[PDB]
Nucleic acid binder design. Structure first.
Ligand code: SAH
Ligand code: CL
Ligand code: MG
Lengths: 217, 217
RNA sequence: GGGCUUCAACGCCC
């Protein structure tokens, strides 16, 4: 099963974009700004401390990359930071399991623009050019997940796609905010539950609906 | 939705047991032994790495308690540590989203043997006595989730349950090891995928199959 | 330089 990348704009797949991801570095030696560790610093910066939540992006990557859909080679993930940085994640990257270690890696990615293994010329993580729509499959239904939107059953929604049409889901990698982070890109907004879901739960729900629709065990 | 506890022996529900959980304490004040804080002193302190993955339990707790099946009131979670300590988790508990606060909570639970509601004397977390079977619904199918078992589709498995039959699933909240931590309790072992899964993904996959089966949206 | 790891990089250890 070939590793999926933005070069291939034909193969039917699921794509998840972790949008409004809170990934921003700051000097002291650089840290990845987070609400827990840098309350004081975020104060001086005149920032909403509540906004610094890189841990949400970390939790979603684990959920997505560990999923059967990813292991079956039918998943791509991108990260679109709240500051407009777009990142392509290699499906085979074994993301750090712990937050502190995820943090150091993100700092490096943001400063160097890619992450590589010493012997390889393949990028495990890469900063790429906006807009994401330039990189997605040509036939791709693009949706934003929103509690404000009509609720769907994921399998049923996916079954209604054309045979050659991918599905790209934009998930707000945040605790609180409006669903307008991808309004320029999406075809539709949908909700996955009568309950408000965390970003990670929304990711797993969409992955497991797609695994069902596509008969991935 | 009425809040499910082990006192209710009748109501049909899903139960998840996080087994072989890593919840070790370390003093200097007490903290949960982990890899981010303690990876450099483990050997020095005569401790195992296996003893320092409480992040796995943390991640599963969030995955489970944030799920629609929990919000619908049809889920219970228990934790059994690698030392045999058994814990009942109230469906309404808010697990802290940061590991730092999670540790404090867990340390207080292990030391006090319970955590009470901010509004009453009710215990939202409580250390209880083995075996887990004393606490499950009287009629309850019991299974261990394991890569090394025959793979099933969750929806079908759940739909085969009797109208009054609950389902309890045991998940290894650990980095690696034999999936034999519940052999004395279970009727059967089953796989959820042809790929190895994280404990968290095993959790969400079973939850989302149950949600589908029970028309929980 | 060498190691460790549900964590090539990161974070650590020697
Ligand atoms: N393919 C699969 N099907 C069902 N459960 C799985 C699974 N892969 C992993 N799990 C669950 O996730 C837990 C953590 S994976 C780590 C343990 C695993 N035995 C290794 O070695 C396992 O204990 C198992 O309960
Ligand atoms: Cl080491
Ligand atoms: Mg090294």
């Amino acid at each position: 099963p070939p590793v999926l990348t933005s070069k291939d704009k034909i193969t039917k797949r699921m794509i998840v974009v972790l949008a409004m991801a809170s990934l921003e570095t700051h000097k002291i030696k650089y840290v990845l700004l987070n609400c827990d560790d840098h309350q004081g610093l975020l104060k001086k910066m005149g920032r909403d401390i509540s906004e610094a939540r890189p841990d949400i992006t970390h939790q979603c990557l684990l959920t997505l990359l560990d999923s059967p859909i990813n292991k079956a080679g039918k998943l791509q993930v991108y990260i679109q930071t709240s500051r407009g940085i777009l990142i392509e994640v290699n499906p085979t990257v074994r993301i750090p399991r712990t937050f502190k270690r995820f943090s150091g890696l993100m700092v490096q990615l943001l400063h160097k623009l890619s992450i590589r293994s010493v012997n390889s010329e393949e990028k495990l993580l890469k900063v790429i050019k906006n807009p994401i729509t330039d990189h997605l499959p040509t036939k791709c239904r693009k949706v934003t997940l929103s509690f404000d939107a009509p609720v769907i059953r994921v399998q049923d929604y996916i079954e209604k796609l054309d045979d050659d049409e991918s599905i790209c889901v934009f998930v707000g990698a945040m605790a609180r905010g409006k669903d307008n982070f991808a309004d320029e890109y999406v075809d539709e907004k949908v909700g996955l539950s009568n309950y408000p879901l965390s970003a990670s739960v929304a990711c797993s729900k969409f992955c497991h609906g797609a695994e069902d629709a596509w008969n991935i065990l």
